[PDB]
């Protein structure tokens, strides 16, 4: 069950005396004509709560007056409960008889508690407060005698705009209209330029660890997805960077170092490690940035295999990336640490040069005739994309107008030209007869098509809603523009 809080839940926002003045204030108020829950039960507590009846537990317990958490001791029963910066504020008024008629609630008590309440129970109407702007009319005695919710409707907006509870006939701008984006698209050229990783990971012939081979990889995208989801990688580890972020960063160059070692030897190809390979055949620097990939390659190497060489003796230690001997002799039957592993090390080089090696760029579909957020090949903007009748030269990617603002772009995948128009916006004005004759208004959306705004008359000036269009000309009264005027008959006409 719900009721209509016609004109209730308004309270004095502060301890300041005001007289014979109209004041605009922003605070947590119950909106006018809200749906207030009617009880005959535990309620949520949000920004604040409106409560009325014809004790409470918030654990802040108010039991009739004893209040305890901290301790403090001191017809329609109308209350407001809010808490800000640790203060639990209670507002209250008691009147004879939700009913109609405006009344503001005086402050009852400010309790310096310092607790966050999100639920409460009553031991009967419950409403909620929210951030809204209210206009308040004070009399000579400092009492609030009336109020306007500046967000309730277009006439209330007009009253707040003009700082008055009475509006003279005319047209007034009260707010702006602006169409928001509904989607977001990113478009990039569909990439075929993938890094030659096949010759690193799917090759037949590899150098041995004592004198390992390398490839220099440039002018491509590294499709890391193919490598980390490989059906046969026993290990994959990155230093200085997480695998899941590799597609968001671009290196100057990357290098693929490849060699064959035995299974239990693979833990030596890492920074900070020492051992037969780490010191004698492949030194991996402690400041290494890159990814190490390794797997069991038995099926393509081992024989029923004194082919791959490594060293037992070298007079001095190796320094990073340099390239007595023994053969591995890999055998089909061994333990997991004793068959061959194929190892690929992808080092990442970043220096003072244009970046060359990136991940693939993903694209979304193309949205037309709607407001979107967009970027085409790196250039951002927002607006409505439509087919263009313009012709770009073969090397041009986007165009600009007289004021050097993006006017159009080329679709990087199909190369059609798309115009970018602004999302409509404009002042919104209220066309009103004087308040002394009528309290209804018509609303005009300046330079807005009526089909995109959400008795509608589309005019040159804008979209006019609420006024009817008639074929009779009259002397003007409230001017709109472009030859159109409005007046009040028994409704508003244009």
């Amino acid at each position, epitope marked *: 069950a719900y009721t209509n809080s016609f004109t209730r839940g308004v309270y004095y926002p502060d301890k300041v005396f005001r007289s014979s003045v109209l004041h605009s204030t922003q605070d947590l108020f119950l909106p006018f004509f809200s749906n207030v829950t009617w009880f005959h039960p535990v309620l949520p507590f949000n920004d604040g709560v409106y409560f009325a009846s014809t004790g409470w537990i918030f654990s802040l317990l108010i039991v009739n007056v004893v209040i305890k958490v901290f301790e403090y001791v001191s017809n329609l029963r109308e209350f407001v409960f809010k808490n800000i910066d640790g203060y639990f504020k209670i507002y209250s008024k008691h009147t004879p008889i939700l009913p109609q008629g405006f009344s503001a609630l005086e402050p009852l008590v400010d309790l310096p508690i310092g607790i966050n309440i999100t639920r409460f129970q009553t031991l009967y109407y419950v409403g909620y407060l929210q951030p809204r702007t209210f206009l308040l009319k004070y009399n000579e005695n400092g009492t609030i005698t009336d109020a306007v919710d500046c967000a309730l409707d277009p006439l209330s907006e007009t009253k707040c705009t003009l700082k008055s509870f009475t509006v003279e006939k005319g047209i007034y701008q009260t707010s702006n209209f602006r169409v928001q984006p509904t989607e977001s698209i990113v478009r990039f050229p569909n990439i075929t330029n993938l890094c030659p990783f096949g010759e690193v990971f799917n090759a037949t012939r590899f150098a041995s660890v004592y004198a390992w081979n390398r490839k220099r990889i440039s002018n491509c995208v590294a499709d890391y997805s193919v490598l*980390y*989801n490989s059906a046969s990688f026993s290990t994959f580890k*990155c230093y200085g960077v997480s695998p899941t972020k590799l597609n968001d960063l671009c290196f100057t160059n990357v290098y693929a170092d490849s060699f064959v070692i035995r299974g239990d030897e693979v*833990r030596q190809i890492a920074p900070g490690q020492t*051992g037969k390979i780490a010191d004698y055949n492949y030194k991996l620097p402690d400041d290494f940035t890159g990814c190490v990939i390794a797997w069991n390659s038995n099926n393509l190497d081992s024989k029923v295999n004194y082919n791959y060489l490594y060293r037992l003796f070298r007079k001095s230690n190796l320094k990073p990336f340099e390239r007595p001997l023994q053969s591995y002799g890999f055998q089909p039957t061994n333990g*997991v*640490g004793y068959q061959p592993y194929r190892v690929v090390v992808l080092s990442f080089e970043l220096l003072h040069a244009p970046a060359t090696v990136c991940g693939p760029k993903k694209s979304t579909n193309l949205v037309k005739n709607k407001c979107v957020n967009f970027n085409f090949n790196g250039l951002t903007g927002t607006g409505v994309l439509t087919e263009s009748n313009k012709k770009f030269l073969p090397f041009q990617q986007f165009g600009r107008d007289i004021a050097d603002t993006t006017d159009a772009v080329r679709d990087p995948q199909t190369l059609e030209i798309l115009d970018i128009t602004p999302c409509s916006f404009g002042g919104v004005s209220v066309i009103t007869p004087g308040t002394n004759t009528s309290n209804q208004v018509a609303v005009l959306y300046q330079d807005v098509n009526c089909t995109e705004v959400p008795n509608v008359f589309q005019t040159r000036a804008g979209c006019l809603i609420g006024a009817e269009h008639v074929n009779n000309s009259y002397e003007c009264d409230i001017p709109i523009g472009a030859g159109i005027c409005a007046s009040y008959q028994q409704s508003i006409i244009a």
Partner: antibody, heavy 119, light 99 residues
Framework: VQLVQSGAEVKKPGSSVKVSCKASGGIFNTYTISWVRQAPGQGLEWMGRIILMSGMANYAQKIQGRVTITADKSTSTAYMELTSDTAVYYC???????????????????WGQGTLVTV | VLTQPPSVSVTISCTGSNSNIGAGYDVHWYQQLPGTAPKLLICGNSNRPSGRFSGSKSGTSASLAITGLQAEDEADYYCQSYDSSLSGPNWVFGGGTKL
């Protein structure tokens, strides 16, 4: 990160069981999920590990052919299922403080609650 | 399987072979309280997560050192390492020591 497993259940001996495990905490540094079991009064036994990215899994030899592990990326879960004991089955993510990704020298840092299955 | 003493009244030993501990592979340590999943206390040779403990390797053996008879930490302690034998990768937990 948090790994939530299934509750206890009873199956007839010789039948099959499917145990889920959802890494609802984040999933941003989780590359692999391992399964370990502990029979009452016993120590822990590794059963298998699945790499979430590739979908590949390795298994302990003693249960090979009667165990499968499936990685469902769309739900961030790993399913441990057995065909044909009363052990507790634990779900744990692999982790190494020296590198990102997965390998042999990693460890099981964050463990789930343990799902018991009995006959 | 890694060999451990049934109980310790101190240090908890863990003895393996050159296929797992003497292999150079990291030996991790866990503390399992009854009623729940094991908690990691050592990663790698001797690193630890937030929340008394140290350790080292020697030959094919490794050990966990716990110092101070605090509270009643009567947990089941386990060592874990990678085994490089059989016919494929596998991880091995030790027998388990009651403290």
């Amino acid at each position: 990160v948090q790994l939530v497993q299934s509750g206890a259940e009873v199956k007839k001996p010789g039948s099959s069981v499917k145990v889920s495990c959802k890494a609802s905490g984040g999933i941003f540094n989780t590359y692999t999920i391992s399964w370990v079991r502990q029979a009452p009064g016993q120590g822990l036994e590794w059963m298998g590990r699945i790499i979430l990215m590739s979908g590949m899994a390795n298994y302990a030899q003693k249960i090979q052919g009667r165990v499968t592990i499936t990685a469902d990326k769309s739900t961030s879960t790993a399913y441990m299922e057995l065909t044909s004991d009363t052990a507790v089955y634990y779900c744990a993510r692999g982790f190494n403080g020296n590198y990102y990704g997965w390998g042999d020298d990693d460890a099981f840092d964050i463990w789930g609650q343990g799902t018991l299955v009995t006959v | 399987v890694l060999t451990q003493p049934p109980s310790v009244s101190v240090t908890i030993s863990c003895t393996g072979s050159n296929s797992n501990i003497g292999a150079g592979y990291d030996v991790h340590w866990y503390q399992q309280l009854p009623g729940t999943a094991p908690k990691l206390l050592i990663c790698g040779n001797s690193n630890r997560p937030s929340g008394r403990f140290s350790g080292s390797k020697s030959g094919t053996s490794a050990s966990l050192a716990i110092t101070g008879l605090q509270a009643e930490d009567e947990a089941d302690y386990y060592c874990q390492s990678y085994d490089s034998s059989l016919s494929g990768p596998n991880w091995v937990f030790g027998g388990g020591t009651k403290l």
